[PDB]
Amino acid sequence: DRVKKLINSQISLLIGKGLHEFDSLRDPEVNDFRTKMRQFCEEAAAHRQQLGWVEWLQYSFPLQLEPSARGNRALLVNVKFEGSEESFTFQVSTKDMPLALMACALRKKATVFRQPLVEQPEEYALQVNGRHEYLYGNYPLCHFQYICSCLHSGLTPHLTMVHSSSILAMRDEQSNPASLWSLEQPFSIELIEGRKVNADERMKLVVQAGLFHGNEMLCKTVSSSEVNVCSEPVWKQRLEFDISVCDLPRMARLCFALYAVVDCPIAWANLMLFDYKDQLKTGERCLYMWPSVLLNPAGTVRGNPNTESAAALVIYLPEVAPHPVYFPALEKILELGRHGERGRITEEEQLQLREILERGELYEHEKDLVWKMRHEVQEHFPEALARLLLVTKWNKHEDVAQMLYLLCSWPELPVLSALELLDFSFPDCYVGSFAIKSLRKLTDDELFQYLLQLVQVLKYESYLDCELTKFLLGRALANRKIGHFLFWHLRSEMHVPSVALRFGLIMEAYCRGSTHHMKVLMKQGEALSKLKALNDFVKVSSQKTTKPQTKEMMHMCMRQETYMEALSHLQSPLDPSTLLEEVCVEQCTFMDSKMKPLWIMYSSEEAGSAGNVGIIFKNGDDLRQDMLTLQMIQLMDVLWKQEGLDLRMTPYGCLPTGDRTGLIEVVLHSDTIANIQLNKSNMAATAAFNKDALLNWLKSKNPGEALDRAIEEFTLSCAGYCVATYVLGIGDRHSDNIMIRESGQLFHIDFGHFLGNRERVPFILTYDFVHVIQQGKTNNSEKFERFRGYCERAYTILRRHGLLFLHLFALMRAAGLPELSCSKDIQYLKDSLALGKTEEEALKHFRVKFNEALRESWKTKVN
């Protein structure tokens, strides 16, 4: 009671919407979602509280493994026991398993504490000091990301031996507290009136209406007559459609567009013809319209919540029968679709089908052949399900029944095929259920990689309670890291009225499943609330006084009790493994740019050097495109690493958390090309030629024999970013948005422009970078051509996974990013990856592009 009221207020606070608002809608679909999902999430919570201590480690601290390890050398490791000042430094092998290291730590403990220990190594897990990261399982140490990272940076792994009893105490502490097909008449509606309409009174108003199954039209669009512009237009007219009521598919949507004619688009609104309980809709419907920026089928099927200002279309859905009409059950659908005729075809016409299912638009006659050979598609080309689904006449209830009968016995498709099936071009609910069914085999790592896309797919859903929401919720309550990012992806969009309800409802259900995590995320939102007020203070102060003055003001404001409490001891929203412990006020600052982004520095005694981390708070900028570009770069990095290619990439964290609000992970010991090239006097890098500056800077960071490895890190990362920016169409590249790490690694930042948004972005080769690759020499084709090789190999690996990028970017069209709104944006990727070409023709083309970029580079070498 007292705890329930408290939990409810904390959820309202966290999700940024009062739960009372859900109740005030007096909406049965909303109410059934809350009840079913609360039950489902509490069941997951109860399952979790009883997990074994290693299972609970898999839940809270899922393994962070190297991409090549998924599906020799000597190493120095520092190991301590929980709450011990003492530590042991010992030499292991990168090929040893954590258990050997633990047995080793236990023998050292037994000799030092003069007692033959009861404790077996099986009773322990290894924590990475001052991080929510553990090393466990039957994997050699080189396979864990943390060890791998330690090996490259030369640093020593610092591990803490944590006992099962301590892990169990964590689990305990974090518990939740105690018949349609007979109706042959054409589909029709009555267009009654419009309310709160705004337009030029010299013009006339028209309502355009159309029936859609996803993107595809179910019949021709039908328009209203030209009624005079006014606030309350009255039509009171029948809009009759060319399609029988019996042929309306389950996921049929009626789409409206109100506009003004002399074309002036005013508003749009959509609705599903069947409700969430599968009942065909009857009665009056007031549709609170969305303003138009003509028909929008991909647009939400729920009304505009701003009922005070919204234009509203009033329509009537006629009572087609004296009793309620429901969409037929699956058993009734399979019955009708059972009855068919199998395609008896010629060896030559069988060859024509193999040619098109292995080939992408088709001519009308090719569709007639794919349809006729639907049984052969199921049995010999199951991966061609998507092509067949697109030839199905979704406006014929019998063709839909024949399609559903096959789909219901269709074998589970690979993950790649299932992602294509989540596209809005497959709106059928049975197709969507099938697609999730084939996605169940996703590993938490694969799931995490595509989570951003699965969250966007939620915007295409017609109903609140769906297989994808249940899937996303079940996977998030089974993995704390999936849970963390599902939360933030939904939270960052609560300011969007079209998704606020759906997203707020998912976050509440999630919270019901993990009370403890809700409190952890509240601690994160509290820190972001203070960073917003701090960034506002900085934005005001900076335009009045100088930068060292505003910086000292920011520090004073951070030194306040409420800022010290809220900004300290939190999990990073960028990475729940990263503990943001003590705020280093003196190290904090902000940028001189328009939005004055804040740079917040942290340290942790327990984590040592690894505890020294930074976050960038941005308010005023939109970080969604950055996050998408950075996730795509990370995807490239994983794909190259699986093919044994490590291009030393830096896919740093980027996370929108609110309205034009988000975080960026600071990469320490890095500087921009512009700052290095300023060629300051009295520096360890000052050059005789500005071309030497960046090489002199690497020289000062990597003394003696260390220079060669820095140059190699530069070359690899350069080849990786050359390919990544080319494939992605990253333009507006200048010296202040390219950085370099002291290790030699080059990386790109600020990705506000991609997919050539519209001009085709050519391949880029910079002479200052070509100069580093060549080890300071004018001619060094040995080093330069090793670079061109890294480029060609990285490019040819991406092309092999070109469909993965296409399917993911197609899913992202749902995000509403202005540079990713239509089909032409995906065309850019098809071109850069030359997917209609052989590997020979594409590499030939890549070479022409790389050589073109070198002739462009030599225009600077001339001087």
Ligand X SMILES: CS(=O)(=O)Nc1cc(C2=CCOCC2)cnc1Cl
| Interface ranges with ligand X (CB under 6 A) | 591, 593, 597, 616, 652, 664, 666-667, 670, 749-750
Q: Taking the CB of residue 193, how many other CB atoms lie within 10 A of it? A: 16
Q: Can you tell me the distance from the alpha carbon of 788 to that of 785, in angstroms, rounded to the nearest whole number?
A: 5
C-beta closer to ligand X: residue 15 or 574: 574
To ligand X, the closest distance from the beta carbon of 442 in angstroms equals 29
C-beta closer to ligand X: residue 750 or 768: 750
C-beta closer to ligand X: residue 49 or 675: 675
Q: Can you tell me the distance from the alpha carbon of 727 to that of 599, in angstroms, rounded to the nearest whole number?
A: 31
DSSP letter for each residue of 326-372: BPPPHHHHHHHHH--------HHHHHHHHHHHT-----HHHHHHHHH
C-beta closer to ligand X: residue 403 or 623: 623
To ligand X, the closest distance from the beta carbon of 575 in angstroms equals 13
To ligand X, the closest distance from the beta carbon of 664 in angstroms equals 5
To ligand X, the closest distance from the beta carbon of 652 in angstroms equals 5
Q: Can you tell me the distance from the alpha carbon of 581 to that of 165, in angstroms, rounded to the nearest whole number?
A: 25
To ligand X, the closest distance from the beta carbon of 675 in angstroms equals 11
C-beta closer to ligand X: residue 194 or 653: 653
Q: Can you tell me the distance from the alpha carbon of 507 to that of 487, in angstroms, rounded to the nearest whole number?
A: 6
Q: Which long-range contacts (CB under 8 A, 24 or more apart) does 814-818 make?
A: 814/298, 814/424, 814/456, 814/457, 814/459, 814/460, 815/456, 815/459, 815/624, 815/628, 817/624, 817/625, 817/628, 818/757
To ligand X, the closest distance from the beta carbon of 234 in angstroms equals 52
C-alpha pair distances (Å), 575 with each of 313, 493, 566, 611, 765: 46, 19, 18, 13, 33
Burial 445-472 (b: 16+ CB within 10 A, else e): bebbbbbbbbbbbbbbbbbbbbbbbbbb
Residue pair 783/715 in contact (Cβ under 8 Å)? The answer is yes
C-beta closer to ligand X: residue 258 or 616: 616
Q: Can you tell me the distance from the alpha carbon of 320 to that of 428, in angstroms, rounded to the nearest whole number?
A: 23
Sign of the C-alpha dihedral computed for residues 853, 623, 502 and 259 taken in this order: negative
- The DSSP call for residue 847 is H
To ligand X, the closest distance from the beta carbon of 628 in angstroms equals 14
To ligand X, the closest distance from the beta carbon of 414 in angstroms equals 35
C-beta closer to ligand X: residue 286 or 749: 749
Rounded to the nearest 5 degrees, what angle is found at the Cα of 347, between the Cα atoms of 341 and 348? 105
Report the first-to-last Cα separation within the chain, whole angstroms: 78
To ligand X, the closest distance from the beta carbon of 7 in angstroms equals 37
C-beta closer to ligand X: residue 127 or 578: 578
- Cβ-in-10-Å burial (0-12, 13-18, 19+) of 724 comes to buried
C-alpha pair distances (Å), 756 with each of 760, 797, 859: 5, 22, 23
Tokens of 630: 């950075």
C-beta closer to ligand X: residue 590 or 846: 590
Q: Under the phi-then-psi rule, with left for phi > 0, alpha for psi from -120 to 50, and beta for the rest, what region is 254?
A: beta
To ligand X, the closest distance from the beta carbon of 718 in angstroms equals 17
Q: Can you tell me the distance from the alpha carbon of 131 to that of 64, in angstroms, rounded to the nearest whole number?
A: 12
Sign of the C-alpha dihedral computed for residues 357, 363, 366 and 367 taken in this order: positive
C-beta closer to ligand X: residue 345 or 591: 591
C-beta closer to ligand X: residue 414 or 620: 620
To ligand X, the closest distance from the beta carbon of 736 in angstroms equals 8
To ligand X, the closest distance from the beta carbon of 750 in angstroms equals 4
Give the helix/strand (H/E) hosting 237.
strand 234-244
- Cβ-in-10-Å burial (0-12, 13-18, 19+) of 235 comes to buried
C-beta closer to ligand X: residue 406 or 664: 664
Q: Can you tell me the distance from the alpha carbon of 249 to that of 280, in angstroms, rounded to the nearest whole number?
A: 11
Residue pair 751/629 in contact (Cβ under 8 Å)? The answer is yes
To ligand X, the closest distance from the beta carbon of 601 in angstroms equals 12
CA 246 to mean position of chain CA atoms? 39
The distance between the two most distant Cα atoms of the chain, rounded to a whole number of Å, is 97
C-beta closer to ligand X: residue 103 or 591: 591
To ligand X, the closest distance from the beta carbon of 616 in angstroms equals 5
C-beta closer to ligand X: residue 428 or 626: 626
